[PDB]
Amino acid sequence: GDDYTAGKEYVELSSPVPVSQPGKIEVVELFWYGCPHCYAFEPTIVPWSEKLPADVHFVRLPALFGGIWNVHGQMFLTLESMGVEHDVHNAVFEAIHKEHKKLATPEEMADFLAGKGVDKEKFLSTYNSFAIKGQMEKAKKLAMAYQVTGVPTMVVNGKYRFDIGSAGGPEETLKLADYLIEKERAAAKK
Ligand SMILES: Cc1ccccc1CSc1nncn1N
DSSP: OOOOTTTTTTTEEOOOOSSOOOOEEEEEEETTOOOOOHTTHHHHHHHHHOOOOTTEEOOOOOOSTTTTTTTHHHHHHHHHTTTTOSSTHHHHHIIIIEEEEEEEEOOHHHHTTTSSOOOHHHHHHHTTHHHHHHHHHHHHHHTTTOOOSSSOOOEEEETEOOHHHTTHHHHHHHHHHHHHHHHGGGOOOO
């Protein structure tokens, strides 16, 4: 009969946000190019996310809160729109937190991406296109609605907000995530 405290481990939003399509549970993690905590979470969240059933869907959304925040995230959405899969996405975080070659401009981004199999022309073509902007505004209005006041931040079904600090550790974050998945799943368990 329960095992977590509201506000202590996970915080429930007074104003919840509905997902686009029902049936599957929404799991969003708002990472940033300036959060070290997100880097140490990668080798821990991957084995969990890539082992989830066909009832849970993880989404990669950056902390687009204007300023330099949105700038340090658009690059990711650009790659996802390129149609590349299993292109060693983790290598990107490496050049950001291990090297930190000031990836704040498209030039530096393309220069680095070109070394892993990325066309500078395609990149810049869609980068400066509305195709990415439509995604940017989409995540922007959702991020602030998910009550994301920090990074990282795991949001489940736009109702429960938690993170490493709130949970009490990277492992505790996974505990809360799995618990909340069943929490929402129970509201529609046939
Ligand atoms: C918000 C966006 C931008 C880019 C890729 C995927 C998405 C859809 S993810 C989403 N849409 N409504 C709720 N939710 N978490």
